[PDB]
């Protein structure tokens, strides 16, 4: 109708490591699309809220956390 005649960074997000399926368990079993981003989750408002409100105090010992369980025995070790 109306065809009258006359007369995106695909390899870049894989290279950088993003848009790859991943999940954080302690945060709402949340999904993360990049490993740099998830490594940035370790310092965040909500992530520290889950830790501290969970009883697992903040900052740098708990950085490598994924599941809620293991860091509980880690905090008992603390």
């Amino acid at each position: 109708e109306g065809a009258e005649q006359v007369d995106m960074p695909y390899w870049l997000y894989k290279l950088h490591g993003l848009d790859r399926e991943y999940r954080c368990e302690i945060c709402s079993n949340k999904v993360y699309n990049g490993r740099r981003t998830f490594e940035r989750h370790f310092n965040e408002e909500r992530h520290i809220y889950h830790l501290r409100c969970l009883g697992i105090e903040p900052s740098s010992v708990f950085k490598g956390i994924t599941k809620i369980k293991e860091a509980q025995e880690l905090w008992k070790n603390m």
Partner: peptide
């Protein structure tokens, strides 16, 4: 394969460590 999937969790590894961070 099995050895790659045999790995302990990093948090399981933290307890063995005096300076876990």
């Amino acid at each position: 394969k099995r050895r790659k999937t045999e790995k302990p969790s990093l948090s399981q590894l933290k307890s063995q460590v005096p300076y876990p961070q």
